[PDB]
Amino acid sequence: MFEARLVQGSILKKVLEALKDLINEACWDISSSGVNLQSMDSSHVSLVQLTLRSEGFDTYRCDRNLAMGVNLTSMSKILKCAGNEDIITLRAEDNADTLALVFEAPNQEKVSDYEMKLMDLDVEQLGIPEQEYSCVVKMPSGEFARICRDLSHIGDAVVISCAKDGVKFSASGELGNGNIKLSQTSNVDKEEEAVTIEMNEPVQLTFALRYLNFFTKATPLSSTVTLSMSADVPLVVEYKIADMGHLKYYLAPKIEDEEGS
Amino acid sequence: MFEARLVQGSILKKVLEALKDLINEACWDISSSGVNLQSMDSSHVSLVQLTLRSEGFDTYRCDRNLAMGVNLTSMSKILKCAGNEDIITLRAEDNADTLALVFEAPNQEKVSDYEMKLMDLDVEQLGIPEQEYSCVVKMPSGEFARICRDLSHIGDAVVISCAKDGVKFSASGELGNGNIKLSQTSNVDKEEEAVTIEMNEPVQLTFALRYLNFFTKATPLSSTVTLSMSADVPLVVEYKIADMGHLKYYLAPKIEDEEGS
Amino acid sequence: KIRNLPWVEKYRPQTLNDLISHQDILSTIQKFINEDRLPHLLLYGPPGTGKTSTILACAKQLYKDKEFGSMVLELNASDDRGIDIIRGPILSFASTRTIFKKGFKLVILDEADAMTQDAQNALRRVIEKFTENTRFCLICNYLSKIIPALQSRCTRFRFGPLTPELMVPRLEHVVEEEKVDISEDGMKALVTLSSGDMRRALNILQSTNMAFGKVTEETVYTCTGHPLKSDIANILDWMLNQDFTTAYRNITELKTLKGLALHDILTEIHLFVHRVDFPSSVRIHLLTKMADIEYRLSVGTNEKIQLSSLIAAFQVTRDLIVAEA
Amino acid sequence: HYELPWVEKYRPVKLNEIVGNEDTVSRLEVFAREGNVPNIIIAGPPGTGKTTSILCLARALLGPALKDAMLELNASNDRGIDVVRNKIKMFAQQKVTLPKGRHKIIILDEADSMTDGAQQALRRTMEIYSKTTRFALACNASDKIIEPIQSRCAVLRYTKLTDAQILTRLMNVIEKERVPYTDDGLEAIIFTAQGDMRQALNNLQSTFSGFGFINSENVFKVCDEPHPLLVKEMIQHCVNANIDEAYKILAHLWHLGYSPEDIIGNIFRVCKTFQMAEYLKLEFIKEIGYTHMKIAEGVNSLLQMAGLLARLCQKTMAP
Amino acid sequence: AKPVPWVEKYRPKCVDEVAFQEEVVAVLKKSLEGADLPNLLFYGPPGTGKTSTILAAARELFGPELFRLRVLELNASDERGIQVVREKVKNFAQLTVSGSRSDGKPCPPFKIVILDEADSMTSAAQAALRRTMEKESKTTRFCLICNYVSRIIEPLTSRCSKFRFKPLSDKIQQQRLLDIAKKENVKISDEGIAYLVKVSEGDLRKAITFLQSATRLTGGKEITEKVITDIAGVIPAEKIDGVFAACQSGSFDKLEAVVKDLIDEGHAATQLVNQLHDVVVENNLSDKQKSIITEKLAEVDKCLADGADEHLQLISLCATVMQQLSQNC
Amino acid sequence: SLWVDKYRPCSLGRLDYHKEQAAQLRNLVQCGDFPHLLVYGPSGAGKKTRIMCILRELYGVGVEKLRIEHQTITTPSKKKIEISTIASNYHLEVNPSDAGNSDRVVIQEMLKTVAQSQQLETNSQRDFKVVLLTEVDKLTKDAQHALRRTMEKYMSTCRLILCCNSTSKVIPPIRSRCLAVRVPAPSIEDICHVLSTVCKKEGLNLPSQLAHRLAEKSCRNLRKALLMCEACRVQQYPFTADQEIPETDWEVYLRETANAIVSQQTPQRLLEVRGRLYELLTHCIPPEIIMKGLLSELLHNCDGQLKGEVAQMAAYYEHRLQLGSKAIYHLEAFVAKFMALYKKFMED
DNA sequence: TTTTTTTTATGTACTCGTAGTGTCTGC
DNA sequence: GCAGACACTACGAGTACATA
C-alpha cells in the first residue's frame, strides 16, 4: 500500500512542467526514506533525479519497496485540472494496476479523483558516481533562468566556463558571441543572490540550450540553484526544493572539435 | 581602437527602434568628430543620416577612422535586453570582426558583453546636397506623429503643402478626404508646441504614409522636429537630440500624373 | 593593387567595349543609352555569355558613383522576390522619384526565371505604368519560365553562345595580364572545352595554370580530365573494328591508364556518330542506346557494366553495317 | 522630360485607333458613343489591345468624371477577399453624379490573378449595384475566371492580330516617326511580332535605334526568328522517321543557346496541335514526357534530345 | 586512450597526405602559397577523397584557431532549403574576413563555404547561390562537393572550377595500404594485398575498412587471400559455374534453384552482376550474345540501383542468359 | 512466450550455426575501434540475434533490459510526428521508416542529437554508444544521404549497426562507409538441428521427416520454421511424419489469385483479380512480395518456353512499381500483360 | 440520371484566429 | 498613482496548388 499526502499542491504544479517536454515518463521508487525518481531522456543526454523525503509529507505509508511508472501525456492534462493551494493525495494498491490522485476541485466544492494506468517499464538504475566535482557554484534561480533564456536568441548551444573568478556563459553563433559573467555578489540583502565559488580547478564545457531551458523551467520550486562540473563528469544542476527534498539534473557535454595540430 | 560610451541606454534603443523596420543594415562611420550613419532603406526610397557628436558620449576614443557595417536585427535583439539608465560601451578593434556592446543587467549586478560580426558592404558614399530649402517648419514631434497616424486611416499617400501660412496635410482616400492645416501655435505655455514658418516659396508634394510613420518613431529623441521641403530636393525630417547629435530623414516624392481630360 | 580573386571575377567587362561577341546587340544598347531611349530589356541566353556583365556595365555608364545607390534596385535569386516584395519595395521604388538628382531609375531583376508567376503577374502593371520613371531589365536562362505577358512588355535580346573566333582575344588579354605561357593548342583546347562559356574558359585556364604552370593541350586535358580526340577515335575504331573481348580490354586499359570518365566518352562518341556516315536505322539504334546508357549513369550504377553496354551498342550494329554493304 | 518608348508613346487614346477585332471594337465604339454598356470580360492573347480597349472605353464614357467614377485595380494591388468585400463594394455603393447612360466603371485588369473566393464575393456586388456601376475585366486565360462571373458579363474574345492589321499600325508609327524602311524589313518585323503589337513596336524601335533602317538584315541582326515554326519542321521529319534532318534542326537550335527545357516545351507545343494520327500523337506525347522527366531530373544533354528524336522516329516504324 | 577506426585515424590532415589526385592537390598547394583560389567543384566516385582534400586544405589555410571563423560546412545531415541559402549562407558570405594565425603561418584573405553532398540540394536553392557566389567572391570561396555533377545546375557548374576525383589506381592504393599496414604493425601477403586492391575498386575508404577488419579478425597475424575473400563478400567460382551450367542446360527449374540458392546464401546482387559480367566478357561467346547479355546486365544494374527486388532482377538476367546460351544449341 | 523468443541465444558462443562468423564477430568488436556494420541477408537468417549478441559482447547483460521511448519530431511542414524507439542504457534502436518519407527528419534531427552528445557515465557505458537503424533498405535516398556525414564525423563516440535484407537498396556512399556483414540463411540441416534442440528442450520428440518438411516449407526462415513447429505441436502433439503443416492465409490467397489469373483471360477476370490484389494490398502485404508470390505460382502453370518472358515481365513491372507510387497500376499491368501473353500462347 | 476521403516533398501565397502590448479612462 | 478596457500588429496555423 502506497498512500502519500502533500502539504502544498504547487510543488507538483511546478515540478511536472519541467518534465513535460524533457522526459517521456515518470518512474517513482517507493521506500521508507522517501520517493526517488531517476529518469533518463530518450536521446540519452539528460538525467533527472528527484528525491522527496518522507519527513516532508503530511502522511506517508510504505510497507514494500515498490516502483510505479506513469506517463506524462495524461498526467500533464490531469495536473492542469487540479488547483494550486489544495492538498494532493497519491494512492496505489498492492495488486491493482492504477494510480489514484485525489485532490480538490478549483471550484472548491467537490473532490476530484483521477486514475492513471501504470506503465510496466523495464529500466535499470544507471548509477551516479557522486564523485568530487572540480567546480561548485551557487546562483539565483530566476537569474539563471533569465541567463539561459537570453542565450536562446543567439546560438543553439551554450558554453559554460568556471574558473575561480566566477561562472561565464558564452553563446557563439552566426550573429556574434554573447558573454556574461557573475562574480562576488555577497554584498546584497537577499541571501539567495549570493553568487559564490567553492572549488578551484577551472572547467570549460559546451552544453545544449534546449535541455538547460527545460532545466530552468523548474525555477520557483527553490530559492537558490547549485551548479557542479568537472573535466568529464556531466553538469549537475541542484535544486533544494523547500523541506521535503531535492532535485538533480545531469546534462552531458557536447563532442569537442578537432583543434589539435 | 574604437571605444564609445553611451551615457544612457534609452537613446540607442529609441534610435534602433526607429530604424528597425526601415533600415536593412547599420553603417557606422567613425571619426574623431563623432559617429556618422548614412544608410538607405530596403526600397531605396528613404535615407537616414544620423550624426552623434563625440562630446555626447561619456568617453570617446578613435585612433584610426573606421566604417563598420553591421546587421540591424541582431543589434535590435541586443538592444532589446538593455536598460534605459545604464552606460553602454561600444568597442571595436583595428582589424577584427567583433563589435562589442558592453552593458549591465536591469538587475544592475552582472555585466553583459554582446559581440556582433561586421559585414563587408563597401557601399559607395551617398552625397547629401546640403542646399537651402524653400520651406522650413519647426513643429512638435508628437503633433507630427499624431497627424501622420490620423492621415494613415484615410489614405496611403499624403499631399503635404507648405506656404507663408503654414503646413497643410491632405489624404485623398477611399472614405473621402482629410485636410488638416495647422499654423501659428506659438501662443502656449510650452516651448515645444509651436509652429514656425521660416522660408517663402509654397510647395506641394505627395509622399507615402508608411515611411512618414516610420520617421515619426523618433519622437522621444527630440521634442521639436524640423521639416524641410522644396520643389526638387526631398522632404527632410530633422530631429535635434539634446546633447548627443541629430537625425535627418530624407523621403522622395511619389510620381503623380495629371488627368489628360 | 592586387587582390585574391577568381579570374571570372578579377576580369569582368566593366565597360560595354570589353565584351566580345554580341556586337549588334551591344551597339543597339549603346545607342539606347546615348539617345536616352532605354526600354525594358529581356536578356536571355546560355550561362557565361555576359548578360549580368552587360547590365552592370550599362548601369555604371548610366549613373555616377555618387548616386548609384539611389537609381539602381538590383534583386536576384539570393534575395526574396515574392509578391509582397513586388507590391512593397519594388512598387515603392517604381512609384517614387529619385533623391539627389533627377533621372530615370533602373530595376535589375537578375535570374528572373526563378520568380514565382504571381510575382511575374504583379510585375506587369508596375512595368507598364511607371515606364517614364523607371526601367526594368529581366535576365534569364530559360525563356519558358517567364510568362508571355512579361515577354510582350520587354524587348528581348538573345545572348547566344560565344563563338571561339571572337573568344580568343579576351583570353589573350587575360593571359597577358597574368603572365601565362600558353601555346596555340592550349588556346584551342580552352575554346574547345569552354563551348561558348567564358566562365569555364577562365576557370579551366586558371586551374591549368595553377596545376601545371603552363597551358598546353596535354595540361588542359589532364587538369580537366577530358579525353583527347585521338582517344575517342581509338575507342570508336576499337568498337567498330574488332570483337567484344579485345575492344573491351583496349578500352579498359585506355580508361585505367588515362583516368577517363564515361560521361565525356559518351558525349564525344555521340558527337562522332553524327559525323560517321551510318545508315539511318543504325544511327537511331545508336542514339537510343547511348541515351539509355547516359541515363543509367545518373545514379549509383557500376561504370564497368555501362562501358560494356557501350561496347555492346556498337557490336550489335557491326554485322548490320557490314551486311548492308 | 524622358521620351516614352513606342509601345507607351503610341498607345491609342481613341477606340477608332485600335486595329484588329473589328466587329467587337466597332460595337465598343457604338457603346462609347451611346452608353449603357453591359459588364464586359475581354479575353485574348497578350498584346492584342484588351487593356487599351477597356481604358479607351472607360475614358470615352466618363469624360471629365474619370477620376471619381472609375476604380482601376491590377495584379500589383492587393484585391484579395478583404478588398472585394470592403473597397469594391464601397465603390459600388458610392454616390457619383453622372450623365444619363453613364455608370461607374470598376476596371479589374488581369483578372486571372484573383483567387476563387474573391471572384465568389464579386458576384453579388456585380448583380446588385448594376444600375449604378459596371465592370470591365481583362484577362488572358478565360478559364481562370469562374463561370458565375462569365455569366454575369459579356465575354468578348480577342483573336490574334493578322499581318495587315499590325502593318497598318506600323505604317502609322513609321509615318509619325519618319522611319525609312523596305517591304522586306516590315515583313520581318511582322514575322518576329507573331501577332503581338507590343513585340512589333519593340522590334521596330530596337531596329531603328540600332541601325536606322528597316531591311531584313537589320531586323534579324537584333531580333530572332520564332521557335515553333522551326520546331514543326523537325516534328514533321520525326513523323517520316528522317533522323538526319531532325537532328540538323535540333543541333541548329542547340548551337543557338536554347536550353533543353525550352526546346522540349516547343516540341510538346508543336506535337499538341500537329496534323498526324491520334494514337501516334499520344505515343509522341508520352515519349516527350518520358524525356522531359529525365530533363527535369538533371540529365539534359544533346545526346538526350537526340535519343528523344530517335525514339520518336522509332514510334513511326513500330505499329 | 579511446580507440578510433582507421578511416578517421588516417584521414589526411594536410594536402600532402592526399593520394593520386595530383591536379587538385597541386592547385591547393599553389593556393597555400598565395595564389588565387577559385570556386571549386569536386565530383567523383565514393571514397576517392573529396571531403578529405578540402578539409585538409582548410586546416592548412586557416589552422586550428580560424577554422570556426572562416569555414562554413553544410551537408545533407542538416537542413539546406532555399531559405537557409538565402539567410545563413548569404549572411556568412557578407561578413568581413577577420582574425590572424598566431603561429606565424600566412592566412588567406577569404572564407570557405563547403557545401558537401550538393546533389541533395534542390534547383531553387542552387539558383539562390549564384549571385551570392558572384558578388561576395572577394571575401569568401565556395567548394561544392557531389558524386553526380548532373544533379548540380549549369550556372553553378559554370561558376565553379570542376575537378573530377579519379578512382585510385592499384599502385597508389597498394602503396597507401602497405604504408598504413606498416604503421599498424600488420603483415599482409602479396596475394592478400593484390586481392584487396582488386576488391576495393578505387575506394580507399573501403580498402582501409577491409584492412582494419581483417586485422581485427585475424588478431594480428598475417592477412591472407582467404580472409580477404571471406570479408569481401566475393561469391565463389563454383556458384558462378553452377549458374552458367544451369543456364546452359535450358531448364528453368534449375535456374530457379540456383537463383534461390544464391538469394538464400545472402549474396548481394551487385556482386553477382559484377562477377557474371567478368565471366561473360572473359568468355568465348559470340559478339551478339555477349552484346545482349551485357546490355541486360547494365539494365539489371540500373534496376538494382533504383531499388528493385533482387530475386526478380536476377531471375530475369538468368532467363536472358539462358535464352542466349540455349539459342545456339 | 513463443519458441522464436524462448530459446534465442544470448551470446555469440551459444549460436547453433555460423559459428566461424560468430568467432570473427567476437574478434571484431573486442578492441572497440570496429567500424559501422551493415548486417544483411534473407529474412529469418538470424541477423537481429547476432546484432544483440554483438551488443551483449560490447556491453554487459543490461543490453537485454529494453524500454519504449516516444519522440516527437517537427517536420519542415511543422507537422509533429511521434516515432517509437527501442532503447537501453547502452544502445538505441530506431526504425525510421515508421516516419515514412519523413524518415530524413528522423535522421537530420533525432539522430544527430544522439551523435553530438557524449555518454553520461563512461564507466558503465563504454566510450561509444550504438544506434541500430532497422530496415535501412526501406529508407528513402534523402535519409541515406543525411546519414553519411553523421556516420563520418561522430564515428569515435557513436557506432552504427545498420540492418537490411538487400544491400542493393542501400546507396554506395553508405555502403562505402560501413563493413558489410553477410548472414546467410541456415541450411536444412541447421534448421533441423535447431528444431530438434528446441523440441528436446521442450521435452518433445521430433522426427527427421517432420523437421525436414518444416525446414523445406519454411523456405530457410528459422522464425517461420519455429512458429510452424509450435503450431504443429499445438494442433497435434503426437508428431507423425505426414502430419499436415499449417500455412499462412495470404500465401494461399495469392496462390488462388494466380489460379484465377490462369483460369480466365478476360477484362472481367482482370477486374476480379484487381479486387483480389486490392484485398492483398489492404492487408499490408508488400507489393514486391505479391509480385514474387505471383511469379512463383504463375511459373508452375506456364510451359517451358514462356517462363523466361513471364519472369522478365515480372521484373520489369516490379521495377516500374518501385519507380512509381501506386502499386495497383503496375500489379494490374503485369497481370494484363501475362493474360495477353498466355492467351497468345494458348491460342497459338 | 450514378459522391468520401488522407497520403504526394518544398515554396509560396492566402486567409483566419490568437496573444502580447501601447495607450486611454476613471476614482 | 494603478487597475480595467480599447485597438494595434506580429505570429501561429490550416489549406491549396504548382501545366497549355
Ligand SMILES: Nc1ncnc2c1ncn2[C@@H]1O[C@H](COP(=O)(O)OP(=O)(O)OP(O)(O)=S)[C@@H](O)[C@H]1O
Ligand atoms: N562576352 C563576354 N566577354 C568577356 N567576358 C565575359 C563574357 N561573358 C562572360 N564573361 C566572363 O564571365 C564572367 C561571368 O559572366 P556573366 O556576365 O555572369 O554571364 P551570365 O550571362 O550572367 O551567366 P549567367 O546566365 O548569369 S550563369 C564575367 O565576369 C567575365 O569574366
Ligand SMILES: Nc1ncnc2c1ncn2[C@@H]1O[C@H](COP(=O)(O)OP(=O)(O)OP(O)(O)=S)[C@@H](O)[C@H]1O
Ligand atoms: N489593337 C491594337 N492597336 C494598336 N496598338 C495596339 C493594339 N494592341 C496593342 N497595341 C499597342 O501595344 C500596347 C500594349 O497594349 P495592351 O492593351 O496593354 O496589351 P494587352 O492587350 O492588355 O495584352 P496583355 O494580356 O495585357 S500583356 C499598347 O499601348 C499599344 O501601343
Ligand SMILES: Nc1ncnc2c1ncn2[C@@H]1O[C@H](COP(=O)(O)OP(=O)(O)OP(O)(O)=S)[C@@H](O)[C@H]1O
Ligand atoms: N585520396 C585519398 N587519400 C588519402 N586517404 C583517402 C583518400 N580517399 C579516401 N581516403 C580515406 O578514406 C576516407 C574517406 O574519404 P572521403 O574524403 O570521405 O571520401 P569522399 O570523396 O568524401 O567520398 P564520398 O563522396 O563523401 S561517399 C578518408 O577519411 C581517408 O581515411
Ligand SMILES: Nc1ncnc2c1ncn2[C@@H]1O[C@H](COP(=O)(O)OP(=O)(O)O)[C@@H](O)[C@H]1O
Ligand atoms: N543461432 C541460433 N540458434 C537458435 N535460434 C536462432 C539462432 N539464430 C536465430 N534464431 C532464431 O531465428 C529467428 C531469426 O529471427 P531474427 O534473429 O530476427 O533474424 P532476422 O533479423 O534475419 O529476421 C529468431 O526468432 C531466433 O529466435
Ligand SMILES: [Mg+2]
Ligand atoms: Mg548572371
Ligand SMILES: [Mg+2]
Ligand atoms: Mg494589360
Ligand SMILES: [Mg+2]
Ligand atoms: Mg564526403
